[PDB]
Amino acid sequence: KGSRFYGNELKKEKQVNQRIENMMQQKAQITSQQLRKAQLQVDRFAMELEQSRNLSNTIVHIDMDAFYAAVEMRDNPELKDKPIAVGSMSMLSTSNYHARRFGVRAAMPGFIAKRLCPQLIIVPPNFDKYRAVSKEVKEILADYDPNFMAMSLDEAYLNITKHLEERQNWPEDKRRYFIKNSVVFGTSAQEVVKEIRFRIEQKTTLTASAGIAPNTMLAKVCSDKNKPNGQYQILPNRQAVMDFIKDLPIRKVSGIGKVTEKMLKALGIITCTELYQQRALLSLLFSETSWHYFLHISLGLGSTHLTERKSMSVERTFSEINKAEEQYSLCQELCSELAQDLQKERLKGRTVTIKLKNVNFEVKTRASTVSSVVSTAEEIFAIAKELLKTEIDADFPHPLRLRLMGVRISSFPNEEDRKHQQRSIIGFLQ
Amino acid sequence: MFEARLVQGSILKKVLEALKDLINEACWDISSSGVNLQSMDSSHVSLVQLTLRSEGFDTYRCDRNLAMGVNLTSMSKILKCAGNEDIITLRAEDNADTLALVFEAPEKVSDYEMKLMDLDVEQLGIPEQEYSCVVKMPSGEFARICRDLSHIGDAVVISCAKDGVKFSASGELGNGNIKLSQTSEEEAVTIEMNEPVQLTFALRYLNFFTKATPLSSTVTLSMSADVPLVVEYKIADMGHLKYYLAPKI
Amino acid sequence: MFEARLVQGSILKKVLEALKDLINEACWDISSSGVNLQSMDSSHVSLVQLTLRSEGFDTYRCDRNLAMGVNLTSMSKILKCAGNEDIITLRAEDNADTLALVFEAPEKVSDYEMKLMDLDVEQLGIPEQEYSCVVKMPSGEFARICRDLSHIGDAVVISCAKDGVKFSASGELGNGNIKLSQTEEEAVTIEMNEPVQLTFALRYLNFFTKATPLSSTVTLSMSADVPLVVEYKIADMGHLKYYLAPKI
Amino acid sequence: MFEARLVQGSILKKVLEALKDLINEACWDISSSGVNLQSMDSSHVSLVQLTLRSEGFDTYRCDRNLAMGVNLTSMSKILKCAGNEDIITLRAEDNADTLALVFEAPNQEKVSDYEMKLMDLDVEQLGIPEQEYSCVVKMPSGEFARICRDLSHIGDAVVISCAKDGVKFSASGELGNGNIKLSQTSNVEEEAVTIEMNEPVQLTFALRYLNFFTKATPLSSTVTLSMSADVPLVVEYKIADMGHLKYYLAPKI
DNA sequence: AGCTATGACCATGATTACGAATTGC
DNA sequence: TAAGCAATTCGTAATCATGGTCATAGCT
Ligand SMILES: Cc1cn([C@H]2C[C@H](O)[C@@H](COP(=O)(O)OP(=O)(O)OP(=O)(O)O)O2)c(=O)[nH]c1=O
């Protein structure tokens, strides 16, 4: 409305509109002669892309159906016909399908959606249960492919290009399960996924969507087509990839978000056919990796064959602070809890990057790289108090009015660089 | 009103020629018994500790404890102006932000003034413990050794035993092994060996340690296990300059 | 046929190594009085006045009165090719634009035939004043005081009273306030009339004090608001004077 | 195996100092007569040759005529880690990847063992057969380094002429032709510039290399130069009666 | 006082680090 | 009064390794 959050998104709106006009001023200064060499180059590379468009594999994505709500619903039998909401009065993680139509979505505050539905319940989650109900599903997913790639706790890219051929010579009770025998599932590529959904159904007391595609980005959106408890399928043939690549908004694809949406509402893009019809425009306008992503999201291309940790953070928000001792003392708890969580995987980090947020919402990530590997609650804090010092005393007569501080260990080392691990001196001092 | 007359001026020139390359700022504690310095550098690998007590000063007086932050390159640019013989008279008032050096040639009485700053160096050091290997060797040889393995690699292996002590380094052009075998008046190699200890350090701090070479001719390397190497120089009748360095792996 | 043979060959070497840094090309006026030069730097502040008389040239012969334009960098890079114990024979003709040099060694002679040029000459005179203060100090101590002072700032305030000559400066750290009191060829003598306190800039005095190996001692010559003389006297050959103007 | 002890531990700190910016890879033919080297440099005009024969060594044993491919820049970075008055022993196995250097001080308390990783290359043994010359000039070493560092400020080419009464080093430039003239010496230490001749010589050479060739000047106190027509200039240094170091450089056009 | 050593100071690509912005779940 | 993690993108800029130059000093 007219909030501080409204003020900072107003400034961000000014900035994105300024970049809109800075793009339109570089859009007018091209001609019909500047649409020649770039178009020929990007379609020569698209000939090099589409000729070896190999899609003999069958990649399956398996989402869930309101995962953080559904795993509560397998553990809350009282209100199965009710709309549930996880989170609290600041932010929602995900709400269920009895409330999606009413507007109760993700990335929405706990006060925006709650004034829309007076009859609702909002209960904070239990983050330990989902880590087990993920692994229970992963037990079923490991059988159909050992190299499955769980992105989050629920999404799961699986490759069933090999399991299907080694299923043809099977009997009619190996391919038949029991309700918790029940209906026999066939040998087709739809049927293996029907079997997977049935096992995840009557082994977790829940439901799970799915999606079959020749590629990964197609699977991510086919998993959204027939969405609650449903599925979809595309056939591996170069014609049939084109009939679904049309008539799609770019509010649906992942990797094209909200601001790259508005920077393409300018050039007249809604469908991916229009997004294909601007080869020499988008190749000259946008950056290198972004026009790469646009030219490969145009023909529907991507990952034809499937494939450690690189950061670990703790951030924390709070009310308004205006003192000098409270920031220095509250950086220590965030150094300590992160030092607890850094040893459970036994990783030696060598960078601390604090990150502060004003009461009028500006990010300030102040980084510092050391040469001593950092593990413990006192070998971090003497790298972050010298950044809280540099950015408290650079406002020389005035305090910092922050609302969020957060530390971030990074640059975890290789096997070539974990045999020479230099140590800090603060282990030895007293 | 801190006031300190040093009749051998080259001691202070040699100290702040040693400390300006490794660290670049310091916070000197000047109290009623001497000058102390405690400083770890930016990468938090080495520590340098320094004490010159109030007896080798040709005159010293101080009435209240002072903390004096000093840019060491500014002080090494000011103290480049004394000759090797200037009676150096460092004066400083208490609540003023300037340190008045007054040189005196043996009547060319210069009078320089420096700006201080607000520096908060960490008020902690290695607690008092006991050490396993204590080599004492000629400091020209120690500087030659620490400058004679950096041509190989950035890792020194100090392997200490009873007959002697061995320095080895292995880098992309090969490897090298210098062996010190014990002696038979200041070319004397005494090894107070207890347990034979093999460790590995970074030469990019051992080369900065050997810039206090004309402050003595005898250096004591004191090692243990899971404990930093100590290199110690003794400024004669004055005090000491110690360098602690952390090991690899 | 001008010939000027000097027997202490290090003289011209220390002179031209004190001049090649400041001014680029200059005019050599060649007469029975000797060798003369007045020139300005390329920033029009300092005024170099070199005077060499004919008494101590070991053999002099100058019939006409010539003027020779030289670029001092090439002349000094020729004057880095002789030892500190040679006999210089400078030579010139009216039929050529070639300043010849011969270095004689007591059996390695060194012939050089350097190019001249043709500059548009400026004969500016110096009205001689009666100086307020003239001080004489050993050359190395002044070289040390200016070089030492250059690390502190650039605004040297030379002060003078009968008891003491008092150099000050300032800068981003604090004022290096050197003194020298009233005091055996290495003494400090102060001839004072009125006390002086006058500003100069160190970044040209540093170009000046590279004539320190010429003489054992220098003389500063000052008046109120008149440009000062810094004079390095070659013994029994002439002198080399540098003029600097005060600021503000 | 090959082991060679040499008491003058400074000669390898100077022979392998005159040869680090010139070349960067060479073929040490370690055989029964002693250490050799032959190398045209990174510009393929200047021919280094080097020989430390056997009888000048303190002790010396090998029978397998081996051919070590030696990187001279890293070897000089290792030999710059020794004292001046040390004693140097070389150690090599037969099929060895590495080579061991032993630096024993005469104080004997400190001993150094360095180990250098080799390589393998093949170099042209472009043999330099028996020739007869025209003019020989035998002169001080600091004088020759001084002459070339003088004339390299004037120009960048040098005419060298040798006649019965001495030598002219004539160096034109953009600013006027320098000229330095040297004569003999009759009845006098190191000052003797003895110049013998059968027919006079006027040749011409460059000066980018005679600021490299007289980097060998702490190795001796007399250099010799030799010259004739249609034969390159021979810049010869002698070492402490162990052998010699030749540089070869050709005339111009 | 020149020759040479050599340590302080300085130009300077260049890899590496920093930081805001953007996307996901 | 508007989260909590992680991952990635580009353009800015800090530090470092590099050779060149200069000054002062041990050696000649
Ligand atoms: C998108 C999003 C998800 N999550 C959490 C909550 C969800 O339960 C879980 C899964 O993300 P998603 O699977 O995309 O969302 P969902 O399964 O809740 O809803 P749908 O089935 O319609 O996709 O991850 C967040 O915490 N924050 C977010 O911004």
Author numbering:
A (entry chain A): 45 to 224, 282 to 408, 412 to 534
B (entry chain D): 1 to 106, 109 to 186, 191 to 255
C (entry chain B): 1 to 106, 109 to 185, 191 to 255
D (entry chain C): 1 to 188, 191 to 255
Could you pull the original sentences from the published paper?
Y-family DNA polymerase κ (Pol κ) can replicate damaged DNA templates to rescue stalled replication forks. The structures of the complexes with either wt-PCNA or Ub-PCNA are very similar and show the Pol κ core docked to one PCNA protomer through the internal PIP-box adjacent to the PAD.
Refinement of this class yielded a map at 6.4 Å resolution, which was further improved by density modification implemented in Phenix44. Density at the ubiquitin positions is weak and the map local resolution lower than the average, implying that the ubiquitins covalently attached to PCNA retain a significant degree of flexibility. However, the density protruding from the PCNA monomer bound to Pol κ is better defined and displays the characteristic barrel-shape of ubiquitin (Ub1, Fig. 4a−c). However, due to the weak map density and local resolution in the Ub1 region, we cannot exclude that ubiquitin may exist in multiple orientations which the cryo-EM reconstruction could not resolve. The outward location of ubiquitin density implies the exposure of the ubiquitin hydrophobic patch to interact with Pol κ UBZs, but the map features are at odds with the existence of a rigid Ub/UBZ complex, suggesting that the Ub/UBZ interaction is transient and/or involves multiple ubiquitin and UBZ conformations. Our cryo-EM structure of PCNA enzymatically mono-ubiquitylated at K164 in complex with both Pol κ and DNA shows that the orientation of Pol κ relative to PCNA is dictated by the PIP-box and DNA interactions, and that the three ubiquitins are partly flexible and extend away from the PCNA ring.
